[PDB]
Amino acid sequence: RSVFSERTEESSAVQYFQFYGYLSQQQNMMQDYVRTGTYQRAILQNHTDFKDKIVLDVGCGSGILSFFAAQAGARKIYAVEASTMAQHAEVLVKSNNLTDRIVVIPGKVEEVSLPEQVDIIISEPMGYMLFNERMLESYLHAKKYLKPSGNMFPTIGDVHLAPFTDEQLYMEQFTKANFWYQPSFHGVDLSALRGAAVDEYFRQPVVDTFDIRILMAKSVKYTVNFLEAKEGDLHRIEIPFKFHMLHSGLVHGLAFWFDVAFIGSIMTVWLSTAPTEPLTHWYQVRCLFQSPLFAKAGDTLSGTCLLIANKRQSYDISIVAQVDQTGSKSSNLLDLKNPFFR
Amino acid sequence: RSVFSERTEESSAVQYFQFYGYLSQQQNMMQDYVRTGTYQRAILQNHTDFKDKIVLDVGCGSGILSFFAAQAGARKIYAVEASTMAQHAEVLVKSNNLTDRIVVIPGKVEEVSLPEQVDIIISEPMGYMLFNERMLESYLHAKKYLKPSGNMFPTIGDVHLAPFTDEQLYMEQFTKANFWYQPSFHGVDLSALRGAAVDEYFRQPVVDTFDIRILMAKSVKYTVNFLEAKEGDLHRIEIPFKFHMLHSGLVHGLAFWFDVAFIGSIMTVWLSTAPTEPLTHWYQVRCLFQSPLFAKAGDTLSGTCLLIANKRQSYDISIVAQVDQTGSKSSNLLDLKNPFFRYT
Amino acid sequence: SVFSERTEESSAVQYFQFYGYLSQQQNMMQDYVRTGTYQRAILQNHTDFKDKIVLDVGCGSGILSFFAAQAGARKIYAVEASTMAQHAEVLVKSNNLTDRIVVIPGKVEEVSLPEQVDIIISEPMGYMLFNERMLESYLHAKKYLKPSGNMFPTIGDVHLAPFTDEQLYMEQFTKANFWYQPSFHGVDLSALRGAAVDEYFRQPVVDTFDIRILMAKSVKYTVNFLEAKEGDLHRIEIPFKFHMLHSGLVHGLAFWFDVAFIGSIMTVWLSTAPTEPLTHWYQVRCLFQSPLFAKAGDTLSGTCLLIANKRQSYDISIVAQVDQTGSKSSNLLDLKNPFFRYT
Amino acid sequence: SVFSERTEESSAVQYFQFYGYLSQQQNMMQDYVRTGTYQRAILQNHTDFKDKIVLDVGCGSGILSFFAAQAGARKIYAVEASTMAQHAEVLVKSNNLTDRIVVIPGKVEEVSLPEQVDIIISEPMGYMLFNERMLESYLHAKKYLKPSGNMFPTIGDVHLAPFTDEQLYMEQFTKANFWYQPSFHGVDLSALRGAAVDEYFRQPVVDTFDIRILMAKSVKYTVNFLEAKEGDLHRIEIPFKFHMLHSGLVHGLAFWFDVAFIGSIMTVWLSTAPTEPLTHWYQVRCLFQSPLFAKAGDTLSGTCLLIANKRQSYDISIVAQVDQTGSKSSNLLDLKNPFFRY
Ligand SMILES: Nc1ncnc2c1ncn2[C@@H]1O[C@H](C[C@@H](N)CC[C@H](N)C(=O)O)[C@@H](O)[C@H]1O
Ligand SMILES: Nc1ncnc2c1ncn2[C@@H]1O[C@H](C[C@@H](N)CC[C@H](N)C(=O)O)[C@@H](O)[C@H]1O
Ligand SMILES: Nc1ncnc2c1ncn2[C@@H]1O[C@H](C[C@@H](N)CC[C@H](N)C(=O)O)[C@@H](O)[C@H]1O
Ligand SMILES: Nc1ncnc2c1ncn2[C@@H]1O[C@H](C[C@@H](N)CC[C@H](N)C(=O)O)[C@@H](O)[C@H]1O
**Residues B132 and B179 both lie in one domain:** no
Going by their DSSP bridges, the two strands D235-243 and D117-122 should be labelled as unpaired
- Among all ligands shown, which has an atom nearest to the Cα of C37? 3
Distances (CA, A) of B28 to B19, B105, B209, C94, D306: 12, 23, 18, 47, 77
Residues B207 and B114 in one domain: no
CA distance C316 to C304: 7
D278 vs D267: CA distance, rounded Å: 21
Range of the domain at B211: 156-344
Where helices occur in D105-207 by DSSP H, the ranges are 134-140, 166-176, 193-201
Is the Cα dihedral C286, C289, C294, C300 positive or negative?
negative
Are residues D306 and D170 part of one domain? yes
List residues bridging with B263 in a β-sheet: B268
Determine the residue type at D253.
L
d(CA B269, CA B276): 17
Structural domains of chain B, count: 2
Q: Is the peptide bond before B154 cis (omega within 30 degrees of 0)?
A: yes
Q: Chain B: which residues have CB within 8 Å of chain C? A: 9-11, 14-15, 22-24, 27, 30-31, 36-37, 40, 62-64, 67-68, 71, 88, 91-92, 94-96, 176, 179-180, 185-193, 196-197, 200-201
- Looking at the structure, tell me whether residues B168 and B315 fall in a common domain: yes
Amino acid in the structure at residue A145: Y
Counting CB pairs under 8 A, whether chains B and C reach 3 or more, is yes
In one-letter notation, the amino acid at residue B81 is E
We report the CATH number of the domain holding residue A143 as 3.40.50.150
Pairing of strands D219-224, D248-262: unpaired
Helix and strand numbers (H, E) in chain D are 9, 16
CA separation for the pair B321, B327 (Å, rounded):
10
User: Is residue A54 within 8 Å of A119, Cβ to Cβ?
Assistant: yes
In angstroms, the Cα distances linking D128 to C292, D330, D335 are 88, 18, 9
Q: For chain B, what's the residue count?
A: 344
Element (H, E) at D111: none
Q: For the sheet with D235-243, list strands across it.
A: D235-243, D299-309, D313-322, D328-334
The Cα C267–Cα D13 span in angstroms is 63
Considering only CA atoms, which of A112, A35, A118 is closest in space to residue A74? A118
Residues 6+ apart with CB under 8 A from D340: D206, D207
3-class DSSP state for residue D224?
A: strand
Where would I find the H helices in D71-133? 84-94
- Residues D60 and B232: their CA atoms lie apart, in Å, by 53
Q: Annotate chain B with three-state secondary structure.
A: CCHHHHHCCHHHHHHHHHHHCCHHHHHHHHCCHHHHHHHHHHHHHCHHHCCCCEEEEECCCCCHHHHHHHHCCCCEEEEEECCCHHHHHHHHHHHCCCCCCEEEEECCCCCCCCCCCEEEEEECCCECCECCCCHHHHHHHHHHHEEEEEEEECCEEEEEEEEECCHHHHHHHHHHHHHHHCCCECCECCHHHHHHHHHHHHCCCEEECCCHHHECCCCEEEEEECCCCCHHHHCEEEEEEEEECCCCEEEEEEEEEEEEEEECCCCEEEEECCCCCCCCCCCEEEEEEEEEEEECCCCEEEEEEEEEEECCCEEEEEEEEEECCCCEEEEEEEECCCCEECCC
CB-based burial label for C106 (10 Å; 0-12, 13-18, 19+): middle
Distance from CA of D43 to the nearest CA of B (A): 10
Contact C237, C305 (CB under 8 A): yes
- Distance between CA atoms of D179 and D132, rounded to whole angstroms? 33
Taking the centre of ligand 3 as the mean of its atom positions, its distance from the CA of residue D321, in whole angstroms, is 86
D65 Cα nearest atom in ligand 4? 20
Are D242 and D122 contained in the same domain? no
Q: How far apart are CA A265 and CA D142, in angstroms?
A: 72
Q: Do A130 and A161 fall within a single domain? A: no
Q: Is the dihedral of CA D131, D137, D142, D143 positive or negative?
A: positive
C-alpha–C-alpha distance, residues D117 and D120, integer Å = 7
Residues of chain D in contact with residue A62, where contact means CB-CB under 8 angstroms, are 189, 192
Closest-CA residue, ligand 1 atom 11, reads A59
Number of the ligand closest to the Cα of B106: 2
Q: What is the resolution of this structure in A?
A: 2.0
Chain D residues within 8 A of B296 when measuring between CB atoms: 32
Contact C213, C165 (CB under 8 A): yes
**Is the distance from CB of C68 to CB of C123 less than 8 angstroms?**
no
Judge if the beta carbon of residue B20 lies within 6 A of ligand 2.
Answer: yes
Nearest to B255 by CA among B287, B223, B282, B277: B287
Task: Check if the beta carbon of residue C88 is closer than 8 Å to that of residue C60.
Answer: yes
Contacts of A23 in chain D (CB under 8 A): 179, 192, 195-196, 199
SS3 assignment for chain C? CHHHHHCCHHHHHHHHHHHCCHHHHHHHHCCHHHHHHHHHHHHCCHHHCCCCEEEEECCCCCHHHHHHHHCCCCEEEEEECCCHHHHHHHHHHHCCCCCCEEEEECCCCCCCCCCCEEEEEECCCECCECCCCHHHHHHHHHHHEEEEEEEECCEEEEEEEEECCHHHHHHHHHHHHHHCCCCECCECCHHHHHHHHHHHHCCCEEECCCHHHECCCCEEEEEECCCCCHHHHCEEEEEEEEECCCCEEEEEEEEEEEEEEECCCCEEEEECCCCCCCCCCCEEEEEEEEEEEECCCCEEEEEEEEEEECCCEEEEEEEEEECCCCCEEEEEEECCCCEECCC
Instruction: Identify residue C23 by its one-letter amino acid code.
Output: S
- The CA-atom distances, in angstroms, between A71 and each of A68, D50, D181, D247 are 5, 77, 18, 53
Residue D230 CB neighbour total at 10 angstroms: 19
Do A53 and A149 contact (CB within 8 A), yes or no?
no
User: CA angle at residue A46 from A45 to A49, to 5 degrees?
Assistant: 160
Residue A205: cis peptide before it, omega within 30 degrees of 0: no
Q: What are phi and psi of D281, to 5 degrees?
A: -85, -10
Ligand 1 pocket test target in A57, A124, A140 with most atoms within 8 Å of CB: A124
CB burial readout C241-261, b (16+ within 10 A) else e: ebebebebebbbbbbbbbbbb
Nearest CA owner, ligand 4 atom 22: D123
Q: Which of B247, B281, B324, B335 is catalytic?
A: B281
Q: Which of D99, D132, D153 is the last residue of a domain?
A: D153
What residues of B are in contact with residue D70 (Cβ under 8 Å)? 327
The 8-class DSSP code of residue D165 comes to -
Strands D235-243 and D299-309, by their bridges, are antiparallel
Chains that touch C (3 or more CB pairs under 8 A): A, B
A215: which strand partners? A164
**Under a CB-based contact definition with an 8 Å cutoff, are residues C41 and C259 in contact?**
no
Rounded distance between C-alpha atoms, residue C305 and residue D233, angstroms:
95
Q: Which ligand is nearest to the CA of C126?
A: 3
Answer whether the bond into residue D153 is a cis peptide, omega within 30°: yes
Q: Measure the CA–CA gap between B273 and B258, rounded to whole angstroms.
A: 6
CB D125 within 8 A of CB D85: no
CATH number reported for the structural domain that contains residue C334 in this entry: 2.70.160.11
Determine contact, residues D283/D306, Cβ cutoff 8 Å.
Answer: no
Same domain, C149 and C163: no
Going from the Cα of C270 to the center of ligand 2, the distance in angstroms, rounded, reads: 44
Where residue C282 falls (left for φ over 0; alpha for ψ -120 to 50; beta otherwise) is left
C186 Cβ neighbours under 8 A, 6+ residues apart = B40, B67, B68, B71
Q: Give the CA distances from residue B277 to residues A84, B224, B284, in Å, rounded to whole numbers and listed in that order.
A: 71, 21, 11
The Cα–Cα gap between D144 and D110 comes to 12
A340-341 vs B54-58, strand pairing mode: unpaired
Residues A218 and A140 in one domain: no
Q: Is D84's C-beta closer than 6 angstroms to any atom of ligand 4?
A: yes
Residue C183, judged by CB atoms within 10 A of its CB (0-12, 13-18, 19+), counts as: exposed
* 3-class secondary-structure state, position D153: coil
Structural Rg of chain A based on CA atoms: 22
Q: D204 and D131 in contact (C-beta within 8 Å)?
A: no
DSSP D182: S
CA distance B134 to B315: 8
Pick the last residue of a domain from B154, B187, B204: B154
Q: Which of D29, D31, D32, D64 to mutate to test the interface with B (most CBs of B within 10 A)?
A: D32
Rg (CA), chain D: 22
C-alpha C21/C-alpha C18 separation (Å) is 6
CA A182, A186, A192, A196 torsion: positive or negative? negative
Q: How far apart are CA D299 and CA D318, in angstroms?
A: 16
Burial of residue A123, with CB atoms counted within 10 A of its CB: 0-12 exposed, 13-18 middle, 19 or more buried: buried
Which DSSP letter does residue D248 get? E
Q: Which long-range contacts (CB under 8 A, 24 or more apart) does B141-144 make?
A: B141/B3, B141/B109, B141/B110, B141/B231, B142/B56, B142/B58, B142/B80, B142/B109
CA distance A50 to A72: 6
How far is it between the farthest Cα atoms of chain B?
Answer: 73
Enter the DSSP assignment of D41.
Answer: H
* Amino acid at the residue D107: K
CA–CA gap between residue D16 and residue D110 (Å, rounded): 15
| Alpha carbons A210 and A170: distance in angstroms, whole number | 14
Strand partners, A185: A188
Measured CA to CA, the distance from residue C194 to residue C180 in angstroms comes to: 9
Q: How far is D116 from chain B (nearest CA, A)?
A: 30
CA distance A125 to A29: 12
> Is D172 in the same domain as D42?
no
| Residues contacting A239, CB < 8 A, separation 6+ | A159, A161, A220, A222, A304, A305, A306, A307
Question: Is the distance from CB of C171 to CB of C165 less than 8 angstroms?
Answer: no
- Amino acid making up residue C281: W
Largest Cα separation within chain C, whole Å, is 74
| Pocket of ligand 4 contains residue D76 by CB under 6 Å | no
User: Which residue has a Cα nearest atom 6 of ligand 3?
Assistant: C58
| Record: contact B326-D70, CB cut-off 8 A | no
Residue of D nearest to A190 (CA): D91
Return d(Cα A134, Cα A235) in angstroms, integer: 9
Task: Name, in order, each residue with C-beta under 8 angstroms of B265's C-beta and a sequence gap of 6 or more.
Answer: B46, B48, B49
Q: b/e per residue, B104-129, with b = 16+ CB within 10 A?
A: bbbebbbeeebeeebbbbbbbbbbbb
Q: How far apart are CA A80 and CA A103, in angstroms?
A: 8
Considering the domain architecture, whether residues A98 and A233 belong to the same structural domain is answered as no
- Count CB atoms within 10 A of the CB of residue D325: 12
**What's the alpha-carbon Rg for chain C, to the nearest Å?**
22
> Measured between beta carbons, which residues in chain A are less than 8 angstroms from residue C36?
325-326
Classify the C-alpha dihedral D115-D116-D121-D127 as positive or negative.
Answer: positive
Q: What is the largest CA-CA distance in chain D?
A: 74
Buried b (16+ CB within 10 A) or exposed e, A8-27: beebbbbbbeeebbbbeebb
Rounded CA separation D243/D259 (Å): 24
Last residue in a domain, options B100, B126, B154: B154
* Closest by Cα among B27, A253, A99, B100 to C181: B27
Instruction: Give the distance (Å) from ligand 1 centre to CA of residue A239.
Output: 26
Question: Following DSSP, what letter does each residue of D257-321 receive, concatenated?
Answer: EEEEEE-SS-EEEEE--TTS---TT-EEEEEEEEEEEE-TT-EEEEEEEEEEETTTEEEEEEEEE
Query: What technique determined this structure?
Result: X-ray
Q: Around C335, how many Cα atoms within 13 Å sit in the side-chain half-sphere?
A: 26
Strand order in the sheet with C145-152: C101-105, C75-80, C53-57, C117-122, C145-152
Q: Are residues D50 and D12 in the same domain?
A: yes
Active-site residue list of A: 32, 124, 133, 281
How many whole angstroms separate alpha carbon C200 and alpha carbon A319?
55
Q: In a 3-state reduction of DSSP, which class is residue D214?
A: strand
Whether residue B64 contacts residue B130, with contact meaning beta carbons closer than 8 Å, is answered with: no
Report the distance separating Cα B304 and Cα B193, nearest Å. 29
d(CA D264, CA B251): 34
Measuring CA to CA, which residue among D254, D240, D246 is closest to residue D320? Answer: D240
Among the partner-chain residues B184, B327, B330, the one whose CB lies closest to the CB of A186 is B327
Name the residue of C1, C3, C16 to mutate for ligand 3: max ligand atoms within 8 A of Cβ: C16
- Give the span between the Cα atoms of B313 and B15, in whole angstroms: 11
d(CA B238, CA B145): 28
Count of other CB atoms within 10 angstroms of residue D82: 22
- Tell me, in angstroms, the distance from the centre of ligand 2 to residue B139's CA: 10
Q: How far from D139 is each of B129, D101, D108, D307, CA to CA, in Å?
A: 58, 21, 10, 18
The sign of the CA dihedral B193, B199, B205, B210 is positive
Residues C146 and C163 both lie in one domain: no
| Residue C219 to residue C255: CA distance in whole angstroms | 10
